[PDB]
Amino acid sequence: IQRTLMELLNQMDGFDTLHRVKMIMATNALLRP
Amino acid sequence: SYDRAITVFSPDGHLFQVEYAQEAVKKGSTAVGVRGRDIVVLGVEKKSVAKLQDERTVRKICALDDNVCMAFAGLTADARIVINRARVECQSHRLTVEDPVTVEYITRYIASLKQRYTQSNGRRPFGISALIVGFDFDGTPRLYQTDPSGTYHAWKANAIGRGAKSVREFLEKNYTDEAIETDDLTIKLVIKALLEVVQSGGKNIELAVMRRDQSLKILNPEEIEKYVVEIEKEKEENE
Amino acid sequence: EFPMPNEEARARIMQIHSRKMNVSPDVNYEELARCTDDFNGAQCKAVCVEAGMIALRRGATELTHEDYMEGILEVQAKKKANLQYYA
Amino acid sequence: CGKTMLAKAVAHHTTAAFIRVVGSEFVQKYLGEGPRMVRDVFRLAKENAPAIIFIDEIDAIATKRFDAQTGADREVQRILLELLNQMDGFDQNVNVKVIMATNRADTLDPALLRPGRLDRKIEFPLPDRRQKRLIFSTITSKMNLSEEVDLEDYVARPDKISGADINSICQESGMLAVRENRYIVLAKDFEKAYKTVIKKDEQEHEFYK
Amino acid sequence: IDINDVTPNCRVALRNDSYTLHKILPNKVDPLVSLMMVEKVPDSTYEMIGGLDKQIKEIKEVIELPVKHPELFEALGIAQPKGVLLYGPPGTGKTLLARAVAHHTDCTFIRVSGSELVQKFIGEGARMVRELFVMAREHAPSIIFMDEIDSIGSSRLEGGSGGDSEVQRTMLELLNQLDGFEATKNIKVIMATNRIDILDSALLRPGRIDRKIEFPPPNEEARLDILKIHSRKMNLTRGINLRKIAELMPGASGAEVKGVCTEAGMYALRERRVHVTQEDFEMAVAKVMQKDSEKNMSIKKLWK
Amino acid sequence: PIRALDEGDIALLKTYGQSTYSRQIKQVEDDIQQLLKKINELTGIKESDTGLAPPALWDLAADKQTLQSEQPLQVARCTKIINDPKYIINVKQFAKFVVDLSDQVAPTDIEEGMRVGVDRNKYQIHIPLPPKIDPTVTMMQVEEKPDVTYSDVGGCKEQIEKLREVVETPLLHPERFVNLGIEPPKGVLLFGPPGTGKTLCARAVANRTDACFIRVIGSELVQKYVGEGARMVRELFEMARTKKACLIFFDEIDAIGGARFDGGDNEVQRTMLELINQLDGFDPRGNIKVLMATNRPDTLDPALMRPGRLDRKIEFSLPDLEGRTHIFKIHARSMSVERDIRFELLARLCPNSTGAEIRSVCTEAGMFAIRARRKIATEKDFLEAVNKVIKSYTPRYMTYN
Amino acid sequence: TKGPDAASKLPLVTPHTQCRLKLLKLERIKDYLLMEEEFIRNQEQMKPKQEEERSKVDDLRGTPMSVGTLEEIIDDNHAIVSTSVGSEHYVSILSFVDKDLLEPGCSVLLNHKVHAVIGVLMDDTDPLVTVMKVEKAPQETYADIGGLDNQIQEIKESVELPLTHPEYYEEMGIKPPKGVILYGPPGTGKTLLAKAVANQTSATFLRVVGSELIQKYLGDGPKLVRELFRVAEEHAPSIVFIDEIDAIGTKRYDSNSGGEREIQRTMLELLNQLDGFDSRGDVKVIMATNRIETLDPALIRPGRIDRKIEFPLPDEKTKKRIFQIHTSRMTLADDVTLDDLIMAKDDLSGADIKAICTEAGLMALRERRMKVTNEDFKKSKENVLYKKTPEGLYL
Amino acid sequence: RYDSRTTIFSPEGRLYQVEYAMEAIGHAGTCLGILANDGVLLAAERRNIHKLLDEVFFSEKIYKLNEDMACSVAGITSDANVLTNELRLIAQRYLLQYQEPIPCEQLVTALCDIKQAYTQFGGKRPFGVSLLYIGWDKHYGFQLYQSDPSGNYGGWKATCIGNNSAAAVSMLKQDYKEGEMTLKSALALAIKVLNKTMDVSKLSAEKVEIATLTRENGKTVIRVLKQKEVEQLIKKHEEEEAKAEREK
Numbered sequence A: 001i002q003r004t005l006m007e008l009l010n011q012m013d014g015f016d017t018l019h020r021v022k023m024i025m026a027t028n029a030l031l032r033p
Numbered sequence B: 001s002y003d004r005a006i007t008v009f010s011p012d013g014h015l016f017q018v019e020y021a022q023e024a025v026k027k028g029s030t031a032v033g034v035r036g037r038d039i040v041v042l043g044v045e046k047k048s049v050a051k052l053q054d055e056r057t058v059r060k061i062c063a064l065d066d067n068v069c070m071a072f073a074g075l076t077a078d079a080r081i082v083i084n085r086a087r088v089e090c091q092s093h094r095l096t097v098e099d100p101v102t103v104e105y106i107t108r109y110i111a112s113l114k115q116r117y118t119q120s121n122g123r124r125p126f127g128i129s130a131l132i133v134g135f136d137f138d139g140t141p142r143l144y145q146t147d148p149s150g151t152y153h154a155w156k157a158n159a160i161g162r163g164a165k166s167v168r169e170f171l172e173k174n175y176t177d178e179a180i181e182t183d184d185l186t187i188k189l190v191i192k193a194l195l196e197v198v199q200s201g202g203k204n205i206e207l208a209v210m211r212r213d214q215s216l217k218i219l220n221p222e223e224i225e226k227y228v229v230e231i232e233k234e235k236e237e238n239e
Numbered sequence C: 001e002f003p004m005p006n007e008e009a010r011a012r013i014m015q016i017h018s019r020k021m022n023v024s025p026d027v028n029y030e031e032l033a034r035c036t037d038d039f040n041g042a043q044c045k046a047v048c049v050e051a052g053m054i055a056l057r058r059g060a061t062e063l064t065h066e067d068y069m070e071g072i073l074e075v076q077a078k079k080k081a082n083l084q085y086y087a
Numbered sequence D: 001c002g003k004t005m006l007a008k009a010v011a012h013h014t015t016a017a018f019i020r021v022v023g024s025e026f027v028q029k030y031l032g033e034g035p036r037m038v039r040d041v042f043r044l045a046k047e048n049a050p051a052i053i054f055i056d057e058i059d060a061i062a063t064k065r066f067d068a069q070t071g072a073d074r075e076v077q078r079i080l081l082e083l084l085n086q087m088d089g090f091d092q093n094v095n096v097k098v099i100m101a102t103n104r105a106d107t108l109d110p111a112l113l114r115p116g117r118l119d120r121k122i123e124f125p126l127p128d129r130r131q132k133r134l135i136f137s138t139i140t141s142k143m144n145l146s147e148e149v150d151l152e153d154y155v156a157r158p159d160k161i162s163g164a165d166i167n168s169i170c171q172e173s174g175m176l177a178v179r180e181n182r183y184i185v186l187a188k189d190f191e192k193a194y195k196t197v198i199k200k201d202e203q204e205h206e207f208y209k
Numbered sequence E: 001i002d003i004n005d006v007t008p009n010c011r012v013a014l015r016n017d018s019y020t021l022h023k024i025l026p027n028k029v030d031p032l033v034s035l036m037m038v039e040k041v042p043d044s045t046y047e048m049i050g051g052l053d054k055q056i057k058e059i060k061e062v063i064e065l066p067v068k069h070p071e072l073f074e075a076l077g078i079a080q081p082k083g084v085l086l087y088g089p090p091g092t093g094k095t096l097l098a099r100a101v102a103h104h105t106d107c108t109f110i111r112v113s114g115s116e117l118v119q120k121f122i123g124e125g126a127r128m129v130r131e132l133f134v135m136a137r138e139h140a141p142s143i144i145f146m147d148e149i150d151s152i153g154s155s156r157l158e159g160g161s162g163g164d165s166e167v168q169r170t171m172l173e174l175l176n177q178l179d180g181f182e183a184t185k186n187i188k189v190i191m192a193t194n195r196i197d198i199l200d201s202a203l204l205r206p207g208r209i210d211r212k213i214e215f216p217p218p219n220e221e222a223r224l225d226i227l228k229i230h231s232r233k234m235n236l237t238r239g240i241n242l243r244k245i246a247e248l249m250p251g252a253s254g255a256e257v258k259g260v261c262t263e264a265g266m267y268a269l270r271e272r273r274v275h276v277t278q279e280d281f282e283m284a285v286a287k288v289m290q291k292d293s294e295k296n297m298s299i300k301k302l303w304k
Numbered sequence F: 001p002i003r004a005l006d007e008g009d010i011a012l013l014k015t016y017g018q019s020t021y022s023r024q025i026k027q028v029e030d031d032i033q034q035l036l037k038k039i040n041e042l043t044g045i046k047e048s049d050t051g052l053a054p055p056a057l058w059d060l061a062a063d064k065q066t067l068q069s070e071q072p073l074q075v076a077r078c079t080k081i082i083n084d085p086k087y088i089i090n091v092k093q094f095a096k097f098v099v100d101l102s103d104q105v106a107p108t109d110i111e112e113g114m115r116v117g118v119d120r121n122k123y124q125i126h127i128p129l130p131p132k133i134d135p136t137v138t139m140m141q142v143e144e145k146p147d148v149t150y151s152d153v154g155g156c157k158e159q160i161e162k163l164r165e166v167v168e169t170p171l172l173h174p175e176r177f178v179n180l181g182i183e184p185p186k187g188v189l190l191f192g193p194p195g196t197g198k199t200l201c202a203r204a205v206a207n208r209t210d211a212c213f214i215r216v217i218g219s220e221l222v223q224k225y226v227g228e229g230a231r232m233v234r235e236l237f238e239m240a241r242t243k244k245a246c247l248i249f250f251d252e253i254d255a256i257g258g259a260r261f262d263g264g265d266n267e268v269q270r271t272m273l274e275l276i277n278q279l280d281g282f283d284p285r286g287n288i289k290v291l292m293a294t295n296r297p298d299t300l301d302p303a304l305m306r307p308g309r310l311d312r313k314i315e316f317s318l319p320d321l322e323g324r325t326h327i328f329k330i331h332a333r334s335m336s337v338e339r340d341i342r343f344e345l346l347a348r349l350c351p352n353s354t355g356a357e358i359r360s361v362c363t364e365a366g367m368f369a370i371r372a373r374r375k376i377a378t379e380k381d382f383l384e385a386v387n388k389v390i391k392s393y394t395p396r397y398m399t400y401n
Numbered sequence G: 001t002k003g004p005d006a007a008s009k010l011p012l013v014t015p016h017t018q019c020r021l022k023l024l025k026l027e028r029i030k031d032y033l034l035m036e037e038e039f040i041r042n043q044e045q046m047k048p049k050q051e052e053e054r055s056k057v058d059d060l061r062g063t064p065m066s067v068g069t070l071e072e073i074i075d076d077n078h079a080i081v082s083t084s085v086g087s088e089h090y091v092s093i094l095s096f097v098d099k100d101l102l103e104p105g106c107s108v109l110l111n112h113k114v115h116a117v118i119g120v121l122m123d124d125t126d127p128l129v130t131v132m133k134v135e136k137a138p139q140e141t142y143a144d145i146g147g148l149d150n151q152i153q154e155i156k157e158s159v160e161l162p163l164t165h166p167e168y169y170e171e172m173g174i175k176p177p178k179g180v181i182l183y184g185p186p187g188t189g190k191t192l193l194a195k196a197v198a199n200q201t202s203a204t205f206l207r208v209v210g211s212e213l214i215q216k217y218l219g220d221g222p223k224l225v226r227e228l229f230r231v232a233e234e235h236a237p238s239i240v241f242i243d244e245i246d247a248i249g250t251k252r253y254d255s256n257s258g259g260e261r262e263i264q265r266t267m268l269e270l271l272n273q274l275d276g277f278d279s280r281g282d283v284k285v286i287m288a289t290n291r292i293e294t295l296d297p298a299l300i301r302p303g304r305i306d307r308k309i310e311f312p313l314p315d316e317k318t319k320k321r322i323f324q325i326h327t328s329r330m331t332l333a334d335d336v337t338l339d340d341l342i343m344a345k346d347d348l349s350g351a352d353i354k355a356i357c358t359e360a361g362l363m364a365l366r367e368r369r370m371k372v373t374n375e376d377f378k379k380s381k382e383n384v385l386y387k388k389t390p391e392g393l394y395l
Numbered sequence H: 001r002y003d004s005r006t007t008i009f010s011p012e013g014r015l016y017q018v019e020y021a022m023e024a025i026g027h028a029g030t031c032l033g034i035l036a037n038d039g040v041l042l043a044a045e046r047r048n049i050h051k052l053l054d055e056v057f058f059s060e061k062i063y064k065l066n067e068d069m070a071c072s073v074a075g076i077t078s079d080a081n082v083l084t085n086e087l088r089l090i091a092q093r094y095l096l097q098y099q100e101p102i103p104c105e106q107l108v109t110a111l112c113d114i115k116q117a118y119t120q121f122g123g124k125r126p127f128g129v130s131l132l133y134i135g136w137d138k139h140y141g142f143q144l145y146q147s148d149p150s151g152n153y154g155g156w157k158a159t160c161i162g163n164n165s166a167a168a169v170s171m172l173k174q175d176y177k178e179g180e181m182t183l184k185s186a187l188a189l190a191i192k193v194l195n196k197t198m199d200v201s202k203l204s205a206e207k208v209e210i211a212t213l214t215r216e217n218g219k220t221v222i223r224v225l226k227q228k229e230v231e232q233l234i235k236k237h238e239e240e241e242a243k244a245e246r247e248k
């Protein structure tokens, strides 16, 4: 389940980055750029 | 869920660990003991030891004192400990009381030691059952069986280990006063008792014979051969 | 939040559900509430009903505290016997 | 170290159909759906061949098969067995190639590492004083950089850092340059980014060491 | 249409207006069970199997002899064997032998391997087994190959959350289809596994798996045979001594022997030549047969 | 070094040996099979029975007259009336239409919410219909008293007393409770080990209920389609409410009364929730005493076990010695036994045994006395039966004395 | 009534050996088959009233005839029937229909156009149940079982003797055992005993596996169980053989899965049919399993399963009997003493004893011999048995 | 399960922890001993043969207990050290009390009693070490004694413990001539057995230790064979194998 999240955040989401839309996650080596 | 602790009673009042210790006795080679008027005999089957091993160290019939002997079933590791403690006990009893140890007393102490080992956690029950016989009553032959639970009983004839039920039924069928009127007939009876469950040739039957005011006499292969030849003669006469 | 009734709540519930029944003045509902830990309101109503039926079984015209305790026992299907080691 | 990046490069440079799945995708509820998805993937590769199947992070379902004693434990073994049968089984695939990426390569099932199933076991070690220089040059080629920055100063450092660490260092250097309203990246912000990324110990509670 | 050919559960065709039965049509097969029948036989032949000759002959006494010459078994008075299990280390030739059997056979070969019988819904696995054996009986004589039988044939686990009961239900349906109330005629099953001790005692019992054929790792002569089989199309140099390569591979498997040939060829590919030398084979022996040890003498020294 | 078999070897093996009669016998066997198949194909009819009345019963050529004249009518319920009045009808799942009555019926007959018949062409209302009664739910009634009575249940005196106090006494004698202001429990959960006699007690209740006894078939409540089980529960409770003092029995309530979890059962859980809110909640249940039995009460939903839905929980524990003796006497009353049988000894020889095991012991004793050609079962046969039933399913007993 | 639908079987031939007497018996059976074929072939051909009534009824019925379910009966000549699509129709009941068997829930026969009730589908059995019925009895008789005398006696006293001699049970005042479970190690003779029972029985025999009782849809499992037991009830003397009951008889437990709870529901329906409200009737149930300790106590409790027949591994006498049975057809040698193979340690099952014979025949075929010898038998034994034990601890 | 602790008895009456300890013995390196008419020997295989590992003791597997006893070791290294230290302690205690060397069987019985006590009392795991014993005594002479983790011993003429024990023991029983073996023949047999008992070919001398027991002038000298004589035995076995294949 963790590895799935790792893959989802490292998918092509940052590839296109359409029209400067950011992610504002709110909650409580995952901290690297 | 009530069989994982020795000191836990089942809802129907069963100490299941003790019965599981009993189950280890049934996995051992059969030992047959029958007492006569002037004789006590300890029949034992051999496991047909490996071709490259010495039988001298696989002794199953051992004598606690000069005139009391026992044959066991179950694990040899616990049986050796039980026999060593029994020898120490009979020597100590001779020390405190100059009278020689009684077969009843040594049986009672073996049962007490077993009971002490099945009385608390952290102490595995002795998974061996012992057939203790001897002329220690000073003129009376006695036979005794100690269950691994810690209970001992006096038997005219009894069997323990694998196939004990069949030998017990056989003995119940033909242990009579006429059958044990002489030493040779009693030894023959032990032979017929051991033949049915141990089907094989020689060296698979070990007999311990002790006479009144005598020492333990482990019969050599030649003697058991002559007795089994006698039994074959009797059965060919019957047919 | 609807919590499990506490001691005062249980006593009040038993008082409410025993209003229609002829009950002795000697019943100590505070003692009953202590005896019924982890009882919901439905279980307290069942306690009152089973106390009424236990009173009716004996042919008693009026309920008693011991009838309520027996009903408490019967609500959780428990049965009380004179244990041979409890004296 | 660059496994998934190399699989991506193969996907971009190939004329065959590319299938990319994660080993964690196969682990599902509803028993018989994991192996069902494995078989679906392989049959899909079969239909439009030539094809390449990339099962990244297969180390999830690759562990040495032992005597599983629960149904959930048997499900992962069943998934692995279905994968083995699909790769080298009765139905020879022909014209489809399977690429797998792990990080251990020693906890994997010996049946998977069989020379009939995973012929080549290529190691992707940490970059050395050479591979690190090439990674730095390749990443910083598109960056504006500056005359005063000397990447050989950072390459020669004894720190053992993967290509992902190099990329993170360069991205933090860009972020530091951009935070100070500067369009040029210099030695100071690059050095600070290097120091920041190098710090990976975090707590370690001081007694494990 | 004769009424006597209208058997229960057949797919008839009914006219658009009066629903008049006008054709008998092929029977209905579950689409997942329909793809289980081999339509294009595999290209593996018996001559491509080296070092396994006794195994082939034993498997042909259950797969070929009972169906080609059933009269011998009636005359002998014995019952025909029904199932064989192929077990051994991975890559020894179990699936290769199953592929070679499916190539030389005249019977309908049906492949059902892995988890094709493990379905999400309850009773689907058992129904798939039942319809698979119905299809096998319809196309008799037939051979069912159950590769990786560990998936469904593992020992039955007691019930509870930690239980595979649905897969166990599928296995029990398979057990009944192999030896149950209704006898199977002219239906043979081949099962392959790497773990014969995992399989349940009720699946391995005679009557269901009559013959257990073991595939030990090839010996030196068997390894030489496999080397000569997998290097037949390779341009071996004059100084090629394939026996020395067999000796350099102690305790190897058939798949590793083939991998050695493949890597020896890949070295020539790297050097852009079409011939392989003894050095290529020796380096391939080292590259393929590279094992992984403990790597920590601490753990190795726990046991004296 | 084994060698394969060749064609000449095959020919010799199938020829060199017994061949004078093997060929004839084999051919006869094959052609006997062929004749059997041919007979079966020739007859192959097994004419399926259809509901055809005796020829004298119908003998009607006017059946064609009513077939041609009378028209079929789709059933539909007039959901809303419109005021020439218009009528909105729901044709089950087909559609909703706005129709008018035919001239045959008057507007007064048709009321909102009742089901009516409409023709298949114009959907005009042609005839009002009686309110729908479910066939599965109406077959859930007993209407046939089982032949077991309270005298057939032994060792459950207090359990029978409580069961009667819930399901029988309030119906027969409501005055004993209203005078003291006692509201009787409306539900019982008969729980205990299997074979202890909860279903037997339910059958005894149904034998003398003198009211409507409804046995709920658990399979019917679990329907393939979504929402159908809850609907069935709803119609079942409605039908119970139409009757006066209904009795509803749910045997093996754990089939549908499993604890909720989070798709799993879902539909079964929804049916269980429907039953839960029918038993207690808004819209008081009414004069409906529910009866529930299960041998695994721990798997039941706590909401269902709540003492507002299952008020009285009667435990069917294993019988004591007096109860076991009573059960032995009950199950041996028809047996051809001797007069000297000590049933107390037999009861003591079955320490923890249900009444079903006692019946099995009696049956096995009869079987033993049948085995040997004896018409009377002696106490020895009962001892053997006790051994075979209880003891079958010595060194262990050596420790106890 | 609808009495038992017993499986058909031909008379058994005793000689076994390919002698002249066996040929004569088979020829006599063939001659009777030919006589029956000739009679029932010349019947319709030699044959040259009710035709008018049948024609009138058939024209009134029309074709095709839709099958629907009767919901309610309104008048003597009107009813509400629901088509297979779920839409109910207020249709007319035609005169040539029994009003006695017209009951709610029954499968009625409807006209295609007018939908008027024109008949009732009597059987309407689920096709997944009618397959379970045994039509061709297995050829394995009681003479094909070695040993198992006590097991055979119990199974007979449970399923065969009550039908053949009910007078003993009637006079004794005991109802005969209506349920038996056959449990033991695999390959011991459980399914063999069930096959022999079906071969010898005169009652209808229904065989299930306990895995076909599980259906994909929600209610179809318990509904299938109810339909199976209803069919068993329809043919009054019936025997239901549920092999591999472990499949659904596993112990009930709190499961967080719809499939496991539905399977538990199927088992609950099974044991409600076995012993619940309403008497089961003259239906006897035989269950088989290799693991009885994993079965739900409610399923195997007395009242449902009355005799727990044990099937132990064969002893020396039983092993000898099985060898005699399975070597009867074989052309045995003279030096072959089966007693050497009969001895064993403790673990030769009946299934193994037959595979030993088959393997010995195969080894004889290898040496081009049709007469098996002792070396063939020992090779077969050491070839066919696969093992799996304590160490040298106990003395 | 019934293997939570050693004191648990299985319903069949089997100490599952004890059986686990014995099955674990096969992980240890191969150890064997041959009893000959003129003496007795032990043979061991060095699993750890890393070139970075220095050999300083030369007795990692074969330990000297008394002036007339020696023992080979197979099992957990820590348990092995504990048992050999206890063996030396018991030997010296008996020597102090009786002023005569231990009759071999007594010392083996002492270890077996200690091991049985460990497998009987709770809170203690069984000693996962099975060790062979060699020695000479005035009552029966040369003896080869086997010990199991459960404390069950037994007299033997030739056994093997460790990796591939069953094959080595089977071939021992196949080609051991009772009462006709000399120490040289026993050494040759041990080398032949160790050749294919371990998967490693050529039987490197550095990977095998052999210690022999002899009775010279009433001294009972315990000798550990140096690399020279071990290599000589290796070459002798190689030449014997070459002679055997000459028939082919």
Ligand SMILES: Nc1ncnc2c1ncn2[C@@H]1O[C@H](COP(=O)(O)OP(=O)(O)OP(=O)(O)O)[C@@H](O)[C@H]1O
Pocket: F152, F153, F154, F155, F156, F193, F194, F195, F196, F197, F198, F199, F200, F201, F293, F294, F295, F327, F330, F354, F355, F356, F357, F359, G275, G276, G298, G301, G302, G303
């Ligand atoms: N107390 C009893 N007195 C007399 N007979 C009894 C008693 N209990 C059980 N029996 C006998 O046992 C048979 C089976 O019991 P029954 O069907 O009532 O079981 P149950 O308790 O409902 O169990 P299950 O959990 O299987 O539903 C009954 O038909 C009856 O003959």
Ligand SMILES: Nc1ncnc2c1ncn2[C@@H]1O[C@H](COP(=O)(O)OP(=O)(O)OP(=O)(O)O)[C@@H](O)[C@H]1O
Pocket: E179, E180, E202, E205, E207, G144, G145, G146, G147, G148, G185, G186, G187, G188, G189, G190, G191, G192, G193, G288, G290, G314, G322, G325, G349, G350, G351, G352, G354
């Ligand atoms: N006692 C026996 N006498 C003769 N043949 C036997 C005996 N037991 C088993 N067999 C043979 O073994 C074959 C397989 O055994 P069977 O079908 O009875 O298995 P089972 O007991 O139902 O076990 P399982 O269901 O686990 O396969 C039978 O077809 C029969 O030929």
Ligand SMILES: Nc1ncnc2c1ncn2[C@@H]1O[C@H](COP(=O)(O)OP(=O)(O)O)[C@@H](O)[C@H]1O
Pocket: D088, D089, D116, E048, E049, E050, E051, E052, E089, E090, E091, E092, E093, E094, E095, E096, E097, E192, E218, E226, E229, E253, E254, E255, E256, E258
């Ligand atoms: N005895 C053999 N002779 C020739 N080739 C073999 C042999 N055994 C294995 N191989 C080769 O090695 C591969 C083994 O794969 P396979 O037999 O499917 O593995 P498994 O036996 O584990 O199913 C095959 O591709 C086959 O070509």
Ligand SMILES: [Mg+2]
Pocket: D003, D004, D056, D057, D101
């Ligand atoms: Mg990656």
Ligand SMILES: [Mg+2]
Pocket: D088, D089, E094, E095, E147, E192
């Ligand atoms: Mg394979």
Ligand SMILES: [Mg+2]
Pocket: F198, F199, F200, F251, F293, G275, G276
């Ligand atoms: Mg019931």
Ligand SMILES: [Mg+2]
Pocket: E179, E180, G190, G191, G243, G288
């Ligand atoms: Mg079976």
